[PDB]
Symmetry: D2
Subunit: 317 residues, 4 copies
């Protein structure tokens, strides 16, 4: 019997509200906006409900403070976080958000244990690992949104240099969602043309490539410093929706995200940004990029960052 | 010559940013986000720019505080306003927002005087009238967003009662965007069936229609009371986009909006909520609904409330 | 566990192929194109498959001659028919297509008895009734596409007169899909304005309305006489997809279609064109239009046509 | 002034009608369907017109046999051809179709000389060269659809092997649209990973790549053999629309098409399959792929086959 698709958004702040907005606009699923703050999800849900007829969507969007309402959710997107932007590093939110995810894990485990969980809450890679351990959900049904955002930024900056449609730039960011993230320049192409060729042709310099890599790594601060009252939320929301689409429509889409990687990239069981295939069984495979020796080292340094913050969490107050 | 469509969003707050998000997502046009507040429009533009590749759109979205950047704009959407939500009525911000729109009027007059202008700034009907006077733009190239939002709520509430797709409800709200808005119950139809028939069939009572009419007029408060930090912004943004679409696509679409009504509804030249036809020449026509004596009276009261508040603004002490 | 939606198209001729094309384009479902003609569905499926990447859809489209391949189909759309356009009346195909539907009913009953069946095969209303009797599927899970096509034509012609967007014209055609079909002028509106008002305003004449009614009734011949090699197929395909959308997305959409009507319009168990609500349980309700005495008589004459052709079939060779 | 976009489709057969269908569905532009055959374009235009309200599009679609009706066309797409499918090679219809394109050239030269012209008529590369010469239109405003169709098939077949979304495969086909097309295997990547890496990882063999390359070159026959009444038309139509989109939306999109290559791939001025950048000024650039010695040679052979057949047409007996 046909049932409507259902996405639960845990945390109805800046990102959560836009996710509901976009999901509703696309008629991808019904949405449940969950939050502990009185009135917030209810007001956003009512507002978004009014827009549905304008978009020609019959998606239902409700606000709640009750985990019972996320029962039967196909996808759970976790945006829940302590207030205030990070000053210097995403891991400043580590202790507070780990405790939030403990609570979220109990709600999910009880009401929708078969859901595909997409974590957004920072510090992303550590939070995803934490959520999986506490919730007990299968590794392939729990992942983190990060790579799509980082890679979209990487692709956009390359596209802005060459003056071409970013959809025609292929480019990946891998590793942890932090300073150590690795935009893999070696496997970048624009319409099938690699960066090495554009260098020979005189259309881009290595220094320009290095600036694009740097820009990608610290892009979050550029947005956050301009917004002042918080961090990026339009693109992170859009990225979460693309990931939800891949699962709900069984796309077998190649998606860079934080996934449990245990037989690739020289690691033996860790959550980190890698190119995955996402479909109706969640994370169905991981693909191995052709990394240079330098890039393999940078990835190693990224893995170290993830392990370091993970150990800090294991010795929390 | 093919040129990209260009939409200028004046005021990059809650509604302005959402308009930019959706316009870009749909690839309806390039977007210029204008604001006086430092950082805000640049930050949102950068964030939204990163999402464009996720949506498969090539729309360019930039942020600015320089009116020279809105030149050649096909459409201008004005959300600029002084801070703080309305208490009981929308017409408390009259003098401040009139002052803001003077600057916008001078900006548009200089850099894009052939633009279709859609005002959203409250108090809507007076602001629209004020902008046209100060700007000197043709009456048919200046209107206000209100009816689409109110009609959308009206359609939504009717649809919830009957348990049907709101897209299959036809319903209009006319008059001023305030407590004296007139949801024309006589114009209502659900897939060809009118409310009178549904009463006779016993599928809706007169008391329920009264509640729906009331809900529509006070719906803005229900949202604001729950958001607590401001007024509705997801649905108002979407409404403005639908109006922009009608213009840019030359749809000849029926759009309830605040337009210069010169020879309909017993008025000689006033900006108020009416069902217009919008195409490439702006407001191209106005339709005449079959209003009941009661609805004629309610609209008459609505017309007076506009002129009352309009004359107060003319008498600048 | 998330499974892809599946639509089976029985008959991969002119309409069938476009249905697959559009369903695939929209990524509404996977498609199985069934036909008895060797090579035809396979070639169309391969061709349409190549277009999927161009549309950004991951829909799978296959061609088959084996009813086993329609197992687990959520929706079955029946386009199967004997060759050649009708000369004067759709019922010329009655005897041949009744026998085809006997075969289709066995395939559906065995492999996907829980499917929502949308019949297109002419003579529509009699074929739908025939399919339901032979297949044994519930009345609410078997219907015929016709009203959406007839009403879209009716709406288009009205829209073409007034020079407005047809989406803003509300108008229904009811009764049998034949010469006796009833375009209900009484409940037509354009942006909430009834035709009676446009007559008073001098914008349309009753004779012009009568021509639009006639044009609607014989529209099929206008298309067919121009195509020469067959009858209309672009719009009928689009109409079938809208009906499939309503079921698969649980829209509660108001859809004029041939449905089993037993407590409305003065009939006690007959398939005929009526305004329905379609959702995940198929035909979930029928709505009652406000018909004039003249329109009630015309509907009576339509019912007689349907019964007459139905009796002819009951006394087949 | 906002004006509607306008696309003229010259030749309203299998491909032409599908282009009209999709353009209208997407509301990309108004459509003029031109043909010499009586009734055909009028019938399809009327049929497609009825579907517009179903799709929620206001695109106007008309049929004609008068070149004056294609005036002011932003894009012209040429499908006009003599009847009958190709036997073994596409270059059998040279003289007949060259004669047809003379008429189209004179029509476009008179009524819409600033139009972006996309030729589809076979033999593609020679027809494109012929049309530009006879029409006198700028080289950058005239191109041929081929590479998008071939690249789409190439991407699709690669994607089927790896079991991933074809949209996440980057792959180009260059050279002539014939047996000497060159699927550049060296340009292939699946989410950043190249075929060389997949070979090393043991996820694809060299023999399988050879089969995929072969499948791509002969794919047109597989479709034609199954359709039996003609050649592929769903995917070719969609390809032409994607090219029109790139122009009308000013996408700066990477489009493999038959373009005037003057200073790349070792040629001084010839129409052949190359990766172009298409925007509002037509073909705005050409990208240089890193071809292997073998691929350079295969492309060289392809270039000769164009000039061979091109010189045969220059020598009109
Ligand atoms: N992965 C990424 O790439 C990425 C990108 C941007 C932002 N982020 C992160 O996403 C998170 C959300 O960002 P935002 O701007 O939407 O934050 P926000 O402050 O706007 O929203 C957070 C919401 O979480 C709610 N919340 C707090 N405690 C909760 C609990 N116990 N249960 C449920 N809800 C609770 C709050 O009420 C608030 O509405 C942040 O941690 C941010 O750093 C991640
Ligand atoms: N018509 C309707 O139905 C409707 C519905 C909802 C809200 N509104 C109204 O729309 C307006 C905007 O709502 P919001 O929530 O986006 O407000 P907001 O406070 O979030 O945004 C207003 C923006 O205007 C900017 N601004 C201030 N002075 C300016 C100037 N001189 N030039 C340019 N920009 C300036 C501010 O920096 C701010 O970013 C309000 O007046 C609100 O009452 C109307
Ligand atoms: N309901 C409506 O409003 C409406 C509108 C237009 C057309 N139609 C009808 O739809 C039907 C299809 O029209 P079309 O133009 O697509 O016809 P078509 O001739 O192009 O296609 C019919 C297909 O049915 C196949 N077929 C024949 N016998 C079969 C069997 N036993 N099992 C499976 N398939 C079989 C044929 O091989 C052929 O491919 C016609 O009867 C036509 O009158 C209905
Ligand atoms: N580039 C590619 O990859 C590709 C792929 C498939 C097909 N094709 C080619 O595209 C062309 C069209 O294919 P189709 O299946 O649509 O063919 P079709 O026979 O279905 O349609 C051709 C149309 O051209 C019309 N026509 C004939 N003479 C004309 C004239 N002087 N002016 C205007 N119109 C005229 C005919 O009436 C007919 O409707 C063929 O040449 C085919 O080989 C190219």
């Amino acid at each position: 019997m046909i049932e409507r698709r259902k996405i639960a958004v845990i945390g109805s702040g800046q990102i959560g509200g836009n996710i509901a907005y976009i999901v509703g606009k696309d008629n991808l699923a019904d949405v449940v906006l969950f939050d502990i703050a009185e009135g917030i999800p209810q007001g956003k849900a009512l507002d978004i409900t009014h827009s549905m007829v304008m978009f020609g969507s019959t998606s239902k969007v409700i606000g709640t403070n009750d985990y019972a309402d996320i029962s039967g959710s196909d996808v759970v997107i976790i945006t829940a976080s302590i207030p205030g932007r990070p000053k210097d590093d995403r891991s400043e939110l580590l202790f507070g958000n780990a405790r939030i995810l403990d609570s979220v894990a109990e709600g999910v485990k009880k009401y929708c244990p078969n859901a595909f969980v997409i974590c957004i809450t920072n510090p992303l890679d550590v939070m995803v690992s934490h959520f999986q351990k506490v919730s007990g959900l299968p590794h392939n049904k729990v992942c983190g949104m990060a790579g799509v955002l980082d890679s979209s930024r990487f692709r956009t900056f390359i596209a802005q240099h060459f003056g071409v449609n970013a959809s025609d730039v292929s480019a990946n960011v891998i590793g942890g969602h932090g300073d150590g993230m690795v935009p893999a320049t070696s496997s970048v192409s624009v319409g099938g043309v690699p960066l090495s060729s554009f260098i020979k042709q005189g259309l881009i310099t290595q220094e320009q490539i290095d600036e694009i890599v740097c820009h990608t790594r610290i892009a979050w601060k550029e947005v956050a410093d301009n917004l002042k009252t918080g961090t990026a939320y339009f693109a992170p929301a859009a990225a979460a929706v693309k990931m939800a689409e891949a699962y709900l429509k069984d796309k077998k889409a190649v998606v860079p995200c934080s996934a449990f990687c245990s037989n690739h990239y020289g690691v033996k069981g860790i959550y980190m940004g890698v190119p995955t295939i996402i479909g109706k069984n969640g994370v169905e495979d991981i693909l191995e990029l052709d990394l240079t020796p330098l890039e393999q080292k940078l990835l190693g340094e990224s893995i170290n960052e993830v392990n370091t913050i993970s150990k800090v969490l294991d010795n929390a107050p």
